[PDB]
Every structure is written in C-alpha cells, then in structure tokens.
Design an enzyme around this catalytic site. Structure first.
Site, short mmCIF file in Angstrom:
data_model
loop_
_atom_site.label_atom_id
_atom_site.label_comp_id
_atom_site.label_asym_id
_atom_site.label_seq_id
_atom_site.Cartn_x
_atom_site.Cartn_y
_atom_site.Cartn_z
N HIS A 78 0.78 -0.93 -0.12
CA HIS A 78 0.03 -0.02 -0.01
C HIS A 78 0.61 1.21 0.10
O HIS A 78 1.94 1.30 0.92
CB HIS A 78 -0.93 0.19 1.08
CG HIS A 78 -2.10 -0.76 1.19
ND1 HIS A 78 -3.13 -0.81 0.00
CD2 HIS A 78 -2.50 -1.52 2.17
CE1 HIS A 78 -3.78 -1.91 0.38
NE2 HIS A 78 -3.78 -2.48 1.81
N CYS A 127 -0.35 0.06 -4.21
CA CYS A 127 -1.87 0.14 -4.15
C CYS A 127 -2.07 1.41 -3.55
O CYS A 127 -1.82 1.66 -2.45
CB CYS A 127 -2.07 -0.95 -3.41
SG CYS A 127 -4.07 -1.15 -3.26
#
Ligand SMILES: CC(C)c1c(NC(=O)Nc2cnc(-n3nccn3)c(Cl)c2)cnc2cc(Cl)nn12
Ligand SMILES: [Ca+2]
Ligand SMILES: [Ca+2]
Ligand SMILES: [Ca+2]
Ligand SMILES: [Ca+2]
Length: 356
Positions: A78, A127
C-alpha cells in the site's frame, strides 16, 4: 561503464493490520530477486515489514550506496500520496494513514540522489486507496519508477498472473544490455542518465579489496541458512531436517524420515513449538507440499516426500530459533504408538541474525 558494487533491497508488504491485505507482492518480489541475482546483485528481500523494521532495512541499503555503486530499491504494497509526497505504508500502519507512520518516497529518493552512485534505481508498485488521486501542486544517474492502481481489487487483478510484473518487464526491456485491466491505474517512469547505464554493466572487479570483502560479508551474514540436520532418535529412527530460504525473512523447513529400524513398522514425524514472535499457525505447518504452506517454492525444487513448514517473520526473532521435532513410532507388534521428542536449536536464521 562499470559498477563498483550491485546492491538491492526489495520490500513486499501484504499482511496489513488495519488495511486490506494484499497478495501480489510475494510473487513479484520473488521474481524480481531471481532476476537481480542473475544480474550479479546482492539482494535483500523482506516481506511484511513494520515501520521500524522497514526504516532499519532502508537505512542499511542507503548506507551501502557509495560512489560508483549500482543500487536498486523496490517496494510493493500500500501507498498513499499527499501534496507531491508519496508514502510507503508499513504493515502496522493505523487507519487512517499518517506521514508519521510511513516512509516518504521523496526522502529516500533525495538521499539516493545524494550519493554519487553510478546508477540509482527506485521502483514503487503502489496500491493506492480508491479516491487517493494525485494532488494539485506547484542529479545523479537515476531511474525512478512509480506504478499505481486505485484499490486493492484493481491492484490484485492487474498483478494476477505469473511473470507479469510491470517493473520486471521494464528492467528486462530497458535496463538489460500483461493486458490492461479494468479500473484506474497509472505508470510513471522518469530518468536522468549522464551516460548509458544498464544492470548488465560489469562490476569493477577486484582481486584485492577490503571494501569489497566487507560488502560481501555484511550481506552474507544475513543469509546464513541453518546447516541441515539429521536427528538420531533412541528407538532407532533417523529424521532428516532440511532448510531452505524463500526470502531473507522466510525459511522453509522440511522434515523427512530417512529410515526406520527393523523393529519399527510404523513411524511418523513432525515439527512443533516454534518461537511465539513468528506467530506460526500449526495448521500451516507440517503440510504435504510447500505450496500448501504458501511458499513460492514447489515440491519439484524442494525435495520430495517431506512434511513442509514455512517460518515467516524471521526478523521478529528476539532470541534463538528453537523448536521441538516430534516422533511417533510403533513397534512391530505393539498396540499403541509411542511418542518421542527432541528439542532443536536452529540459531538465528537469515535476517534474524541482525537481532534488531
Ligand atoms: C546490510 C545488509 C544485510 C543489507 C540490508 N540490511 C537490512 O535490511 N537490515 C535490516 C535491519 N534491521 C531490520 N529489522 N529491525 C528490526 C527487525 N528487523 C531489518 Cl528487517 C533489516 C538491506 N539491503 C541490502 C542490500 C544488500 Cl546487498 N545488503 N543489504
Ligand atoms: Ca492524494
Ligand atoms: Ca504477478
Ligand atoms: Ca535480542
Ligand atoms: Ca494408547
């Protein structure tokens, strides 16, 4: 040209505590480290780092970046972005994100640009959160790569497949010598090169260098795998205990019975009792393929017939890696199986030897 050394750090964050759990980084870190070792890089490959672990890992990579060395940093997991500043999110980060709990990309990048390195490569496979688009805002030899997908579904769809990792394609196509799926995604590659640099450039090769020797041994210390064992059990059984590294912080163990004695006609063996900091679920230990443990390693590169156990999280080992091998045995006419044990110390395997 020439490289004074070739050094690489690869982080794949997946098992997020307060954020959706990603799955792709395992595969793409494995594949890219395989590529990089074939290109003469010494590589560190770390899955699931918390902020502290992640900062210590990046700092030692940055400490290896020196005049003339070629350095590759890769992150998958992330990310977020705020005001031109992009952030790598560690697996222990709270919800919502903060800059205080995250490693800022631009800080690593300005430190990489400082060193007078012969090639800096910094690749990020982020992400993003769905609504977290880029904001309205106002050297050394560098290749900066930055990929984004909006949302974990788009991320995991686009990264599904083998071999199809964006940056492994880029380095193969562009630094030597995957259908577009639904959602919002972006790729940015920026470069500034004084002369052509490639990952295939030779290392400036030393017979007699203390600095080169230090660099090799500093990395090699973090990659001593346990010297594979065969355990004598007093009933006459021998159990073979073998080891394999899947990542710098992930070791596969494999247990096998190498022989039974004449008097024993039934025998079974397994491992248990691992250090609590590694958090091993015993339903993911003792499996009949390494694939069943979640490993990239298959039952055709690891040896056959074993019970396989994946020890992930080896950087969290406070003390020694100590476990129990259990034996079950059954004598030629006996009504009941006998149980036996021996305790094994396995040391500090792999990155656990840094003891941080
Ligand atoms: C010096 C060498 C081992 C090295 C790194 N070093 C680290 O990654 N160091 C670390 C240091 N500390 C923790 N940690 N702190 C707490 C719990 N784990 C971790 Cl995960 C990693 C990193 N990258 C590279 C590349 C090469 Cl080539 N070598 N190398
Ligand atoms: Ca934003
Ligand atoms: Ca992939
Ligand atoms: Ca300690
Ligand atoms: Ca009984």
């Amino acid at each position: 040209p020439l490289a004074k050394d070739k050094v690489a750090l690869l982080i794949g964050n997946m098992n997020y505590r307060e954020h959706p759990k990603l799955k792709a980084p395992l595969v793409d870190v494995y594949e890219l480290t395989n590529l990089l070792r074939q290109l003469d890089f010494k590589v560190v490959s770390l899955l699931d780092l918390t902020e502290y672990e992640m900062r210590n890992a990046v700092d030692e990579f940055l400490l290896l970046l020196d005049k003339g060395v070629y350095g590759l940093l890769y992150y998958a997991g992330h990310g977020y972005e705020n005001f031109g500043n992009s952030f790598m999110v560690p697996v222990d980060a709270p919800n919502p994100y903060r800059s205080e709990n995250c490693l800022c990309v631009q800080n690593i990048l300005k430190l990489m640009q400082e060193k007078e390195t012969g090639l800096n490569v910094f690749l990020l496979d982020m992400c993003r959160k769905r609504n977290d688009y880029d904001d309205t805002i106002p050297t050394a030899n560098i290749v900066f790569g930055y990929a984004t997908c909006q949302g974990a579904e788009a991320f995991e769809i686009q990264h599904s497949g083998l071999a199809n990792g964006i940056f492994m394609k880029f380095l193969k196509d562009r630094l030597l010598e995957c259908h577009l799926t639904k959602g919002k995604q972006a790729l940015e590659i920026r470069s500034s090169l004084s002369e052509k640099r490639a990952l295939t450039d030779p290392i400036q090769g030393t017979e007699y260098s203390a600095e080169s020797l230090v660099r090799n041994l500093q990395w090699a210390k973090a990659h001593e795998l346990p010297e594979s064992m065969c355990l004598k059990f007093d009933c006459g059984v021998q159990i073979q205990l073998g080891f394999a590294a899947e990542f710098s912080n992930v070791m596969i163990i494999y247990t096998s019975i190498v022989y039974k004695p004449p008097e024993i006609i039934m025998c079974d063996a397994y491992v248990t009792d691992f250090p609590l900091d590694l958090d091993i679920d015993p339903k993911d230990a003792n499996k009949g393929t390494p694939e069943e443990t979640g490993s990239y390693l298959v039952s055709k590169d690891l040896p056959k017939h074993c019970l396989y156990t994946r020890l992930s999280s080896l950087q969290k080992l406070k003390e020694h890696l100590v476990f129990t091998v259990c034996l079950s045995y059954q004598y030629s006419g006996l009504e009941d199986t006998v149980e036996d044990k021996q305790e094994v110390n396995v040391g500090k395997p792999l990155i656990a030897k840094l003891d941080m």
